[PDB]
Amino acid sequence: XXXXXXXXXXXXXXXXXXXXXXXXXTYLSWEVSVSLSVGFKTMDFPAVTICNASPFKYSKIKHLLKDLDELMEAVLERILAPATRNLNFSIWNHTPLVLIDERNPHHPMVLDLFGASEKICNAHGCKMAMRLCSLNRTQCTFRNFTSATQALTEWYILQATNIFAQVPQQELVEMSYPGEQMILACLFGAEPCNYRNFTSIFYPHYGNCYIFNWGMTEKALPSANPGTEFGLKLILDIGQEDYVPFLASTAGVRLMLHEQRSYPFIRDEGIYAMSGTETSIGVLVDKLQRMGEPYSPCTVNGSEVPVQNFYSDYNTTYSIQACLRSCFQDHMIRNCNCGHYLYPLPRGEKYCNNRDFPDWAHCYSDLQMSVAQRETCIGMCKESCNDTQYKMTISMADWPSEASEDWIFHVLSQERDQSTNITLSRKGIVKLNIYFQEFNYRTIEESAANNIXXXXXXXXXXXXXXXXXXXXXXXXXXX
């Protein structure tokens, strides 16, 4: 049956062809295997970013927004408990706060003057809201609010943003918190650190911020010992009586943790540190090791993203949140050719002002509360292979003692020796203590399972086993 054996020769190769698809499906599966390594090793100390909720000094900014602060007390006068000489209605006519009544569903009525007979809607049907009018009093939307406490605060942010946009940037740094005033005592454990070792980023909404170290200024400082005595120890001096009284309600100070060479994102990842306490923070190094771009979608370099990065002025590295903030400014320019103040302005453009673009109040807030606009940037920009999170353990205890209250405040009462003003807030200083914990490594590394053995050579010898089986009957015929 030599002719019948030839028909089975194609059938035996058919099973090899059927198993050949399995070898192709394995290689296109791109399977990885995770692995764990937990233990303390020599890791560089992470960059500690210091910010504050109050962006500027109120005693050095009062001539900028004097008309707005006088206008704010007139709004609080009618709402709490009922003449304005110079109220400056042009600021009020930018975004006038309106009133929506839902007592009558058949006919809603409004009363929108706002500067027991002059009380305003203490019931449940009242909804104090805003209007956004783009040169037309019939296309005015309503940003609805139901509690009038922080609705006035969110109104105050947008009115201040229109003020800080026309102020030039270099002049605006000097009226923020200085490096010598905000932080005074810096301790590392082995080497001293001053204000000069810090560098500054003018973040537009929280003012002047400071970071401990980068790779841009000097080399990183490694710490190869777990200990609260080692690591960064900071003593802050915060002017609680020098806050902006309406923009920043929270009196705490901002402490942040991020990568060594990266732009510090401020409202993406930041924890509060309480005044009068020792914010004791034990850090972790939570790393994710993506195994390349064909196994999992990743951008290890950052050139794969079509959207240009507007964070190249600080010369940082690629990150996740750099796409979502740069595109939302870029989607603003394609709709309204003027830049928003809270994001870094592109080169050659201009911050958006009411003197040049009165449509700023509606063009920004409509894109802000748009789910489909924000969903576009999520699927457009990709992820990053060196994903590094920073877990932390925050515990605090009241730092200044009853024995040192007569003692330790007198030492700080002359290291700020200036001929103009000194801050002596007894309950406005912050003790900090940042240290490595016992086990810092919580890493997820991925090994490649697509070898040449199991994916190709395994199917090769298996097909050869069937191929030798065809020669097995041939050897018996030759015997």
Added chain:
Amino acid sequence: XXXXXXXXXXXXXXXXXXXXXXXXXXXXXFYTVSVSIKVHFRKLDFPAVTICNINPYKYSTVRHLLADLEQETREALKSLYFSHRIPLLIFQVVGFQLCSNDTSDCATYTFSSGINAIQEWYKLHYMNIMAQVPLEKKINMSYSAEELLVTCFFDGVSCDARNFTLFHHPMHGNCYTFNNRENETILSTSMGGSEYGLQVILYINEEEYNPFLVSSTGAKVIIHRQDEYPFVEDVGTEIETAMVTSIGMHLTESFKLSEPYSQCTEDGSDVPIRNIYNAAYSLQICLHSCFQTKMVEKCGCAQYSQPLPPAANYCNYQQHPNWMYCYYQLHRAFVQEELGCQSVCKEACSFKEWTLTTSLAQWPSVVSEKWLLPVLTWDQGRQVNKKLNKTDLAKLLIFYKDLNQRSIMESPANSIXXXXXXXXXXXXXXXXXXXXXXXXXXX
């Protein structure tokens, strides 16, 4: 062909070894699972945030319910420093004599500190006095939806108490839960950060606490998903009243497989344990469910902290003398395997868990007391009596940090039979060696 019956037989014996090696790795890979860790970006479903106040029913309201208990409590404070079935004795040890109807085995209690021994006597009577109160009377006496809730912000849309639901709890009064409504789209976050999280400003009255139930002040918050029970009995992350407590979280998933693998169930199909909570299956819910099953059969009544089964009503000391020793009798056997809830009930494969990283600061500043406090007095239109103190206005921020869904899945190597082609070729090769041994045997 004398050597031909050993030459092909050597290939036949090697075939069976090749067939066994393609079979030994076949069954082993069938039970072999792999850990798949992958984090991706999408619209994260915001979890059901439950706000529970540690303050019970209003102390000015509960006077005519508990006038007899506070007179008995202050009388014992004078001597040491409704019925009288369990007076406290002196052993310097303050304790009790938890006796049954028969005094052959009377349970004992030994304690050292007087400040913590006076609270535990008050917690005992509090379970039973409010047990005889009907559930319709518990709603009017506890916190309403407008008292605890002041400001409800979520992604710019100003929510209210109409989105919160009335979830009554016997240990904390009325709890209110955000993003948990029937026939409603679950709200989802879109941008990470504390700006577009759940921004809640709370309020607890300072002069209206219960001075013997709990000494501490501050509402508790539980992060949990929609279908599961919140379980605010034991788990709790308390919030300081005077100032802000911001909470960051992360969505960590956990997927396992039940039937060919490590044991689970998805709806309790393996055990006859009736789910009293009417929630999704978990290991915590199943332990409390089998406890109240054996409690009604043995003690004859249901615990006040646990919800009501459809069998019977609550427990009461003036109605039943000996349920208290019966309640302590189960916990002596619940530690060991006498009840068998560890043996009968299984675990749960699919469950989520959030890691809470808190941070605190002063929310009323020294330059905000002139304007922030009177507006919050103005906003609370129900309780306008005085200016609100800053030690009563707790602010809560719950938000995703960087919008990361760290998912851990389990997928076997032999999922579809096309992946078992390496074992299928080992079987055909071993069968090819089975046609050589019999061929060499005859010749």
Added chain:
Amino acid sequence: XXXXXXXXXXXXXXXXXXXXXXXXXXXXXSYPVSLNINLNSDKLVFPAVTICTLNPYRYPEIKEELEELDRITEQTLFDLYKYTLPHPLQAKIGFQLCNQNKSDCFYQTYSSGVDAVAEWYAFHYINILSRLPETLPSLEEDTLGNFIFACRFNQVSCNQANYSHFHHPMYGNCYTFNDKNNSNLWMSSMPGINNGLSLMLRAEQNDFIPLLSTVTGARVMVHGQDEPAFMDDGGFNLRPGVETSISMRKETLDRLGGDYGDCTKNGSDVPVENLYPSKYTQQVCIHSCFQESMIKECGCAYIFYPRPQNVEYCDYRKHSSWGYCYYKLQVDFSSDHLGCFTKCRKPCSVTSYQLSAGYSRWPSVTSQEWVFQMLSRQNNYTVNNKRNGVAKVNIFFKELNYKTNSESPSVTXXXXXXXXXXXXXXXXXXXXXXXXXXX
């Protein structure tokens, strides 16, 4: 031509005989690893809780020598700040640190006077505390009737609690409740606050020394059972006057030994001597070679870590170059010059505790009328209108299970070479029949 197409035709059906024997040999040219996630439902055996203070308790022996430090401190702060010892500090204020017969001196400078004085006092008080007679204390001062008001775990007391005691030279008094391994150890039946640990601590507002004890809180730190109370790792510094709900999430690690990875099951084959009386960990190699490196370099033993019996602790009157001996080695240890990170391996039994927090003020306005009247009649505690000194601590388990990161070896595909072995065994044999088929 005919013979050339016949002799070369036998090399076309025999070339695959070594093609799957060399490529497969180059393929494997290693121990594979694998990971499994199991949720072991155990009985939740309760770990040890180390409770320490935040004030160094001065001794009556050192009391005649501690007041001389305050005499120099008052003299220094009146001169440089307007408010003998061998090392005077003088300015930017700093600190001179020299070696025996050496002109170069590391100037321990500081930016501000707060951390300068707090570290200048952390060089004398830390050093003169080594002059204590290491004996059993003849007068037992039980501060558990003063420092801890209530020990409440699973609704009982802690009168029969075999507690360990050691005075930390930087933080002060300490207490650990579960260093023993007897039958009366603690375990958590149900993950409840009422079924967990409940503590009430007296955080002392008036400190014994205002120079070193610049905090008034209280330290709460959990660890293992045989593991030591390390306490430089860090724990919960807690505000006096609030209740803290400490929830734990146990995350353990189980790996393979030396057959697969770089790990040891027990500290037996390591070259570093087990200086602790505890079990093996990572700190028992790093912080013991660093102790023995001080023995090799100088004649001093370090005070924050335990001491072998063949040497005493170091003193500046005994060895005037101790501060140079510690500062030069610490900056040399971080550069991995001693190689102690490479000599000792990692432990295969790693048990870390995830720690979260929850804060709430412990007295109410109704409690300040009643509790401070109750507490003053019990353990003689006066009230302070500025701050509240007591603090309530609640150790708590989040849920019954705990995530086990157990590492597992691979199945028994490294046997493919053996599969290719029999495949190549039937390759050369079948190739001979192809050439003999022509005949």
